[PDB]
RNA sequence: GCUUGACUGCGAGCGUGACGGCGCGAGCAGGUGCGAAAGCAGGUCAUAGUGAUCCGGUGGUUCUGAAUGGAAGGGCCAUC
RNA sequence: UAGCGGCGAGCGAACGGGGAGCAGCCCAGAGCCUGAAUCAGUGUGUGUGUUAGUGGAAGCGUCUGGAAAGGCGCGCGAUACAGGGUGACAGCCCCGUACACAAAAAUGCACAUGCUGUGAGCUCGAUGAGUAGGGCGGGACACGUGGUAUCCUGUCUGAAUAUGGGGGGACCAUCCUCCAAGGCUAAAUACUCCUGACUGACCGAUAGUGAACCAGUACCGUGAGGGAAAGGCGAAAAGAACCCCGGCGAGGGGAGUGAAAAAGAACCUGAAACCGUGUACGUACAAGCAGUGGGAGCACGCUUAGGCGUGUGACUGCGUACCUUUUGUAUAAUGGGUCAGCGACUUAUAUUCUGUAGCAAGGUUAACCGAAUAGGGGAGCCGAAGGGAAACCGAGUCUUAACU
């Protein structure tokens, strides 16, 4: 029972290969140099599915404190009175309203003033 | 091949109805008067082997 | 039922381990071997009763005894082996004809083992204190 | 347990224990295993770095030429070398303990009774030695793949089954396990199940 | 002062050890010393003062004893 | 196992039992009767085997296709459906196969028989001496000098004579058993350079022989010796007439053959590393494992818009390869130029445990026989009894004079 290993040697490379289409000189084409390429590629992956949801928050943590400001307030105070007032809008749909509807923000802004006075 | 026994071992252990093995004490073949009567008397009768040798002592009996 | 359709029983077939085949596997690299050492090596580890190098037990500790010859041509019978024989007529070749003790055997004895329960007749065998007691009761004889 | 024979309309008074018993799947299975076993030949071999041809000569000096150390021009690592486990003629047969056999051909015989795959027949034979008769008696019978199980062994019905790939012919005596299960139906004569009765106790 | 308990067989129960081991022990049987008696004594206030196994020597022994009776040799107990 | 054993590492019987096979004779000498049993050499005859061989059943239509053995329809042979070949996969086309046969000549083995040589049967004898034994040194016995029997003998010695001698594991007695110092002998047993037939859960060109091939070659070495690489066009060469560029080149473009030249001889398939030509997008103010998360723009598809696929990736957050070895490695420690193929926990026998199956106070047979994976074979082995060094006793036993 002597077993020749080519075919399943070839679709395991290939299947690595195929992985590392864009990268650059060996990466893409030297099995081993891509085999570690695309490892490097899925452990970056992994950390940025948690990091994307830091990124993305510090974002719009930045722009309501823009907008915010815009109308009078820095963002610290302006989240405690939205806490105060029972508005539980969060900071994705707030950065948008202060980007779409500068109005609706400012109408936000004077329920926060509203729940501080 | 057939394992072959540990000739020395066997000698100086024999397995008991429980799957033990009994062997003599050391210390009673010479340097004999400086030694206690009751300290010779205990090592007298036959004792069984500890939990840490049974390992050891089946290794060097296959067939006991 | 067809030569496609027959399996083992659960269990009856267990898969041998393989080692060095990956990570994934759980007995890649060193096999379950460990790092270095005599153990980790090929024929390497240590023999039966080796201790390091410390006077081993089986060296530690005396001998004892003699064999006798006389034990090995000595034989011991069961109340259930009296009722085995061809005849009723328990003898060193009725034992020996029954397959009950071995051809070289010399001496038997007829001990309190299982249970007798025909009347037979017991002959040039010593009997214990018990089995003479079970063989009389079942209405059997013991003679020289 | 009785037996109903195909056009005879007759019964024969079989053992439960032989023809009724349930079907031991995992004691059936064993016995298969062996006998497929049993029927292999074990004659290979490959060479060892022992057994390569070429001499004990260490390829280059163990120190100062930048090469890996080389010992044998037949190591298994080398192109050419020996093999690291090399096969030698081995028997692959099995024991089967005497009692897992006839348990098995028990609970066989008794699966083709109640998966109606056993035929019962006075008598199974042919004139001639001649394959046509065998194939016409077959077509009236509506057989097509079958082992055919007589009582003591008959040379024409033997020599009329050989070019006939989906037929087998056996005496009682020489029944095996295999073909028990190997072909769609099984018929049997009424010597054989009398014969298979007193081997199988 | 008198003496040989520096006793022989054992030992509930413990301590301390990876183990081989080492230690403490009341009580039981036999026999003994001292004391009027209750009692005490299985060495020394205690904790060092030591050498496993193998091989071999000596004495003892309801064990074994290669055809059988012996014997040699072996075992067991004491000891070197 | 019993033993042997720096009683270490190891070494390792026999008695007895089950089987295969079985066969017994001659000389140590003379007489009586004489070529009487056997064996070898060898003429002839027959049987049979080998070394060439002979015969050996039964299919056609249609479809696809370059080609039919394939699909479909209907037949037929089979003691032959083992296998191979034939333009794709054939019981019926070809060679075979089952079965039935054959030798002028040489030869093997049997018996029958001729011849030369050898001697059968009977009676009365005879009965292996530098030998057995011993001292010394060694060796062989499972047995290492041990309490060491038995065997061989280099050296020195040295009996008895069947009213005798050897052995029964120191040695002695008793008893049992055998008869050394002369020789022969088939079978069951071991093996494979070679011949023929067949077979394989053996390999399939880095495998299998070193060698599929003009290989023990080429090549290396003074020599002994060492020792490769290297298979595939197509069904058939139909292996490319003829024309053109070119050096009466190499190489190429046409033509033609062919089913195909997406088979052209470096020839089936034709991977990967590696190197080009073309297009899309990005890139000449920009610093690091080269990705990943966000993301504009461009290109190209969608959907009959829908802020969506695909390629690219300005700009931006984070981010020092993998293996190994280590307390700890981006480490300026190790290993790897890259790719493809190969390359390392196996196998046999013991042994124990777990799972699983059978049978169960029983379970199971080994060699071998075989009716050959059956059945026979229970020789054995493990278990239902232990305790004690043992004798021995025994559901107990040992310890001790005896155990609370
Ligand atoms: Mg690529
Ligand atoms: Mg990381
Ligand atoms: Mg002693
Ligand atoms: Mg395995
Ligand atoms: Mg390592
Ligand atoms: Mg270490
Ligand atoms: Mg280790
Ligand atoms: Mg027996
Ligand atoms: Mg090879
Ligand atoms: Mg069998
Ligand atoms: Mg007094
Ligand atoms: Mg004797
Ligand atoms: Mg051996
Ligand atoms: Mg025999
Ligand atoms: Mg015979
Ligand atoms: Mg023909
Ligand atoms: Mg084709
Ligand atoms: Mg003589
Ligand atoms: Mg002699
Ligand atoms: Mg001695
Ligand atoms: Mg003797
Ligand atoms: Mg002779
Ligand atoms: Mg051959
Ligand atoms: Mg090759
Ligand atoms: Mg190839
Ligand atoms: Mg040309
Ligand atoms: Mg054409
Ligand atoms: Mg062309
Ligand atoms: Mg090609
Ligand atoms: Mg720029
Ligand atoms: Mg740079
Ligand atoms: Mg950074
Ligand atoms: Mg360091
Ligand atoms: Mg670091
Ligand atoms: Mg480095
Ligand atoms: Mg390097």
């Given at each position: 029972a002597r077993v020749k290993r080519g075919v399943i040697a070839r679709a395991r490379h290939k299947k690595i290969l195929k992985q590392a289409k864009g990268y650059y000189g060996a990466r893409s084409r030297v099995y081993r140099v891509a085999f570690q390429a695309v490892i490097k590629a899925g452990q970056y992956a992994y950390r940025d599915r948690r990091q994307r949801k830091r990124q993305f928050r510090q974002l719009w943590i930045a722009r309501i404190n823009a907008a915010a400001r815009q109308n009078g307030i820095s963002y610290s105070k302006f989240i405690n009175g939205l806490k105060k007032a029972s508005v539980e809008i969060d900071r994705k749909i707030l950065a948008d309203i202060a980007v779409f509807d500068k109005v609706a923000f400012t109408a936000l802004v004077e329920k926060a003033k509203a729940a501080l006075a | 091949p057939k394992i072959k026994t540990v000739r020395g071992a066997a000698k100086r252990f024999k397995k008991t109805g429980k799957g033990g093995f009994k062997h003599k004490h050391a210390?009673?073949?010479?340097?004999?008067?400086?030694?206690a009567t009751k300290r010779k008397r205990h090592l007298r009768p036959k004792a069984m082997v500890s939990k840490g040798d049974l390992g050891l002592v089946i290794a060097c009996l296959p067939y006991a | 039922m067809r030569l496609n359709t027959l399996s083992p029983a659960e269990g009856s077939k267990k898969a041998g381990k393989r080692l060095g085949?990956?990570?994934?596997?759980?007995?890649?690299?060193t096999g379950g071997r460990?790092?270095?050492?005599?153990?980790?090596?090929?024929?390497?580890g240590v023999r039966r009763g080796?201790?390091?190098?410390?006077?081993p037990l089986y060296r530690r500790l005396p001998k004892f005894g003699f064999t006798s010859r006389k034990a090995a041509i000595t034989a011991e019978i069961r109340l259930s082996d009296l009722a085995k024989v061809e005849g009723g007529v328990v003898d060193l070749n009725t034992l020996k004809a029954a397959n009950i003790i071995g051809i070289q055997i010399e001496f038997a004895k007829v001990i309190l083992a299982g249970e007798v329960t025909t009347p037979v007749t017991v002959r040039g065998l010593r009997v214990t204190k018990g089995a003479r007691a079970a063989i009389e009761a079942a209405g059997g004889k013991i003679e020289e | 347990m009785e037996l109903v024979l195909k056009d005879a309309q007759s019964a024969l008074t079989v053992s439960e224990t032989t023809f009724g018993r349930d079907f031991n799947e995992a004691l059936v299975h064993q016995v298969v295993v062996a006998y497929a076993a049993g029927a292999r030949q074990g004659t290979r071999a490959q060479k060892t770095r022992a057994e390569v041809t070429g001499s004990g000569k260490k390829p280059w000096r163990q120190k100062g030429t930048g090469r890996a150390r080389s010992g044998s021009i037949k190591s298994p690592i080398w192109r050419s070398g020996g093999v690291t486990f090399a096969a030698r003629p081995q028997d692959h047969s099995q024991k089967v303990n005497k009692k897992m056999y006839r348990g098995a051909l028990k609970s066989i015989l008794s699966e083709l009774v109640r998966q109606d795959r056993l035929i019962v027949v006075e008598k199974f034979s042919v004139?001639?030695?001649?394959?046509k008769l065998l194939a016409q008696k077959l077509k009236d019978m509506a057989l097509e793949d079958v082992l055919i199980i007589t009582g003591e062994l008959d040379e024409n019905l033997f020599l009329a089954a050989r070019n006939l790939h989906k037929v087998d012919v056996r005496d009682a005596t020489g029944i095996d396990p295999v073909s028990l299960i190997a072909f769609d139906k099984v018929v049997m004569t009424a010597d054989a199940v009398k014969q298979v009765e007193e081997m199988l106790a």
């Amino acid at each position: 029972a002597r077993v020749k290993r080519g075919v399943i040697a070839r679709a395991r490379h290939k299947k690595i290969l195929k992985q590392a289409k864009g990268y650059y000189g060996a990466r893409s084409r030297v099995y081993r140099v891509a085999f570690q390429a695309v490892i490097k590629a899925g452990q970056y992956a992994y950390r940025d599915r948690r990091q994307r949801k830091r990124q993305f928050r510090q974002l719009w943590i930045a722009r309501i404190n823009a907008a915010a400001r815009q109308n009078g307030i820095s963002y610290s105070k302006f989240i405690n009175g939205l806490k105060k007032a029972s508005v539980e809008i969060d900071r994705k749909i707030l950065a948008d309203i202060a980007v779409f509807d500068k109005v609706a923000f400012t109408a936000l802004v004077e329920k926060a003033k509203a729940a501080l006075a | 091949p057939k394992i072959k026994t540990v000739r020395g071992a066997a000698k100086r252990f024999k397995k008991t109805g429980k799957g033990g093995f009994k062997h003599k004490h050391a210390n009673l073949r010479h340097i004999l008067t400086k030694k206690a009567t009751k300290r010779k008397r205990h090592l007298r009768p036959k004792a069984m082997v500890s939990k840490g040798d049974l390992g050891l002592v089946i290794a060097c009996l296959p067939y006991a | 039922m067809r030569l496609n359709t027959l399996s083992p029983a659960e269990g009856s077939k267990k898969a041998g381990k393989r080692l060095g085949r990956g990570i994934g596997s759980g007995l890649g690299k060193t096999g379950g071997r460990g790092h270095k050492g005599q153990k980790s090596r090929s024929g390497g580890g240590v023999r039966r009763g080796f201790e390091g190098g410390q006077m081993p037990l089986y060296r530690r500790l005396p001998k004892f005894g003699f064999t006798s010859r006389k034990a090995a041509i000595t034989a011991e019978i069961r109340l259930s082996d009296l009722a085995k024989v061809e005849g009723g007529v328990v003898d060193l070749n009725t034992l020996k004809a029954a397959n009950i003790i071995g051809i070289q055997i010399e001496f038997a004895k007829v001990i309190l083992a299982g249970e007798v329960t025909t009347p037979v007749t017991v002959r040039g065998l010593r009997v214990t204190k018990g089995a003479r007691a079970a063989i009389e009761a079942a209405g059997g004889k013991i003679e020289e | 347990m009785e037996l109903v024979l195909k056009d005879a309309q007759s019964a024969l008074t079989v053992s439960e224990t032989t023809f009724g018993r349930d079907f031991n799947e995992a004691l059936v299975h064993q016995v298969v295993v062996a006998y497929a076993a049993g029927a292999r030949q074990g004659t290979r071999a490959q060479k060892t770095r022992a057994e390569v041809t070429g001499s004990g000569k260490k390829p280059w000096r163990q120190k100062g030429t930048g090469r890996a150390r080389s010992g044998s021009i037949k190591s298994p690592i080398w192109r050419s070398g020996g093999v690291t486990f090399a096969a030698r003629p081995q028997d692959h047969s099995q024991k089967v303990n005497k009692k897992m056999y006839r348990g098995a051909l028990k609970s066989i015989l008794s699966e083709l009774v109640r998966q109606d795959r056993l035929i019962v027949v006075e008598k199974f034979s042919v004139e001639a030695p001649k394959t046509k008769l065998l194939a016409q008696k077959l077509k009236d019978m509506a057989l097509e793949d079958v082992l055919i199980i007589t009582g003591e062994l008959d040379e024409n019905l033997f020599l009329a089954a050989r070019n006939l790939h989906k037929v087998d012919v056996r005496d009682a005596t020489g029944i095996d396990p295999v073909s028990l299960i190997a072909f769609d139906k099984v018929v049997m004569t009424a010597d054989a199940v009398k014969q298979v009765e007193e081997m199988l106790a």
